[PDB]
Amino acid sequence: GNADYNLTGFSQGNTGGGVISESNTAVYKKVYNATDLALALKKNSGVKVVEIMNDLNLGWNEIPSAAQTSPFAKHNDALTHPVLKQTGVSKITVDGFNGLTIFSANGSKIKHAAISVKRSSNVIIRNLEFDELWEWDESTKGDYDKNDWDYITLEESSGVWIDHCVFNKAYDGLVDSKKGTSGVTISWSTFKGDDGSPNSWVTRQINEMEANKASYPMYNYLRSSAVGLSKEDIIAISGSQKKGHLVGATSDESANANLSITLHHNVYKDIQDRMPRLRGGNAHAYNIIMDATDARAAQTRITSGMAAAIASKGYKFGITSNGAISTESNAVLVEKSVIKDVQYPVRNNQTDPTNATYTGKIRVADTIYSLDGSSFRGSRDTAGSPLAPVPAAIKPFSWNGFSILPYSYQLDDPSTLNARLTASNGAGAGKLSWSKDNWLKTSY
Amino acid sequence: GNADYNLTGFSQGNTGGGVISESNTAVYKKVYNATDLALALKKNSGVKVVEIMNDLNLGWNEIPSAAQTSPFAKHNDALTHPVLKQTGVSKITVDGFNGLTIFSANGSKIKHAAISVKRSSNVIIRNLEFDELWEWDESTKGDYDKNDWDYITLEESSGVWIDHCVFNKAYDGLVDSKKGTSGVTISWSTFKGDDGSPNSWVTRQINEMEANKASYPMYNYLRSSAVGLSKEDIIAISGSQKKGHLVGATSDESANANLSITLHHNVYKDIQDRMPRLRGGNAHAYNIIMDATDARAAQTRITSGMAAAIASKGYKFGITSNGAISTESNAVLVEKSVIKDVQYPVRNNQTDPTNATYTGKIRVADTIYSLDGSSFRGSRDTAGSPLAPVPAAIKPFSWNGFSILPYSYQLDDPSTLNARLTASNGAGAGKLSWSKDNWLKTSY
């Protein structure tokens, strides 16, 4: 039952904005447009609950002039997506809030904006879908290093629960946790790539370039006889999301040791990397799914000779196939999860395998794994395990600062997890239909 | 002016155990004896603040039986000091801590024990004096290569602030940083030798040998007609501390590139060497004093013919006169400091001056220097400077991995620095008397 939906993990104790009546207009704000949101989330507003009432199109050029002020700012410019070049892209900074809930009753969408949570505590964000924050990268040749658009970034914050949300493609990260942010739980959420339908977000981006190839040199090269990718090939390869969760963004900073995050009952569908990528702190994932089936299929479209031609011109275009990554003395435990078609599911050092300073600790327990039709269920520790950490000499697993995790939690069997998380009442926004006061609660 | 006491430098971002009330007994431990310390510093104890309440005598043979267990272990045996042969010497290993402050309210002493910090992050150590961890070396003939007793060793750790501490003689090093440890600041601290008073620690060691000369072949040789040193001469020459800070202990290890350390507002009185000695990484010293006046005086007791007689028998006994040393592609900047009676204040290659791989980068900016009554104020780099790096071909200075230091800081003028640091509210333990909660803070 509904206790399956309880707050668990490192965000334990977070009550957000509390249980507040919708009639308490001073502290419960119903948001219908960008101006309402700007007024509600203005620093020191004192607002405790923000109810998003409908989809919000929050790009810098489409919002009312009254909304073009803190907490909204113009983000880095859209350079390539025909829609985003019109709408613009905003960055909305939630700063200094202590005890805040942002939710919608029926899975409203947040489009064309990044959210940054800074210097805040006890923030709950639930039942929202995040979309239309990706575009093709010409400027940095496939590296996605310019726009810096991420759906949610947490900085120097404490106690954050993101739950029953859905995230689509992003130029950079989906949910990143930085600058010592502690007490994060992300649960019951869907992270997915583009599905390649004929009017998909990615297809719309590619169709624009196909009609004007000379204006997009990387795209033009990929389509040219030097490489030989079809437009359909490029849509398929571009469908998967390049980056999941960056937990600790700067190398060898001691504030990273304070990062803590729990991921559970989430689906990561065609996410190429960072589930999570950790530096220094403590991350626990249980009952998650990393299903990279479509990304793995897309990789079949790039042969070795094509890959050589792509890289020979300095372009990055292809499929990364990573799962969980622990670096820089971090601790990651994955348990009772399902991993499909991820080639390197368990990584312990990204920077220099013979420099132990860059190695993290990582362990996987009772997890189902499949690669190209293989079948394994077990741990990272048994001889020959396909979940063994690579590539550095292994640092024996232990948490950082405690012997056992400081919370209890309920575990499902991984063999039935895919059915549960992909059901009509599974992970994501707009799946759970109950009275809206339930979105303010943290246990059932 | 309490902001003068702010945490700065590479340990920025370290908050230690945080602000915790002394009434919060689960995580704030008052330590009166070795057993209390052993319980508080046991791996995974979860303790955040350790308040040392009084001087601690922590030798392996003097502590309670209940304290003879991890995190305490027996160190290498005392072979020569009459006191240490009775008390024994312990090694206390702080392992796996994240966010820990160890302090005392009034400058309590830690005696007869080495502290090793391993695999830890965000550690603060303040207002403690470290003493009685030196003895005469017969076994390695003056090399001090056997006992391996150091007051503090940091290994594979991140974020360490040592501040308002005092260090006396040690067999080996005072504070060493190893195995890729980064984010270290040492500030407002005193490092001093023995003062040669009639019951000083060094005098007690020499008196024991004077009464039993045949049992100490090196001491006996030095006193013999082959050399002609008096007991008083040997006490004076032994008074200075041989080694300061070893930052990177193994030649050409890739983890050395990750070492970072800031030294500031410290006094190094009669320290012969290693202020700091760096391999590979980055070290910044500002507003420090290296005052080797008494060591320089002691050197006058060894004439050329005496020195030749000492060396001819394979003994090392004398006065090294080094300051800051950068090796193996490391970067050391010293600025706004005072250096007195150090003959070789700036060194760039200890292992083989004809091999550039062993040369480090080093620069000194606006520093006051005096040798045998001379007077200079200036930099490393100007013609005829007595602060020029020796002895290898000079590598142009630059930091490793960054262009400018990743932190901001205020510089005092070196002309008033000696007065400031040797004042009643100057560097060292037992010097600041403010309410004890101030020892937990990192800014003022």
TrEMBL record, chains A, B:
Question: Which SMART domains does the record match to this protein?
Answer: Amb_all
Kindly state which keywords UniProt assigns to this record, in alphabetical order: Carbohydrate metabolism, Lyase, Polysaccharide degradation, Secreted, Signal
Gene Ontology terms, MF aspect = pectate lyase activity
Q: Which InterPro entries match?
A: Pec_lyase, Pectin_lyas_fold, Pectin_lyase_fold/virulence, PEL
Q: Where in the cell is it found?
A: Secreted
Q: This protein's superkingdom?
A: Bacteria
A GO biological process this protein is involved in?
Answer: polysaccharide catabolic process
Give the UniProt entry's GO cellular component terms. extracellular region
Record EC number: 4.2.2.2
Q: Which residues form the Pectate lyase domain?
A: 59-323
Gene3D superfamilies, per database record:
Single-stranded right-handed beta-helix, Pectin lyase-like (2.160.20.10)
The principal localisation class reads: secreted
Recorded hits in Pfam families, A to Z, give: Pectate_lyase_4 (PF00544)
The UniProt similarity line reads: Belongs to the polysaccharide lyase 1 family.
Q: What is this protein called?
A: Pectate lyase
Q: Which organism is it from?
A: Paenibacillus sp. 0602
